[PDB]
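>> received
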Amino acid sequence: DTYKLILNGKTLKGETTTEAVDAXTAEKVFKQYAXDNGVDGEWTYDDATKTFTVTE
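>> returned
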């Protein structure tokens, strides 16, 4: 499955996608991604479109 991540960091904002079987694997790719991008915000998840959002 293709999951999307919307980052709304104080400086780091944007979107990306990953191929994962489960929204565990996706949450924990996105939550390394947002680790590397230094983003620490509130994580929301739109399960309909399989999109996470990090509201920093």
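>> DSSP finds one helix and four strands in the chain.
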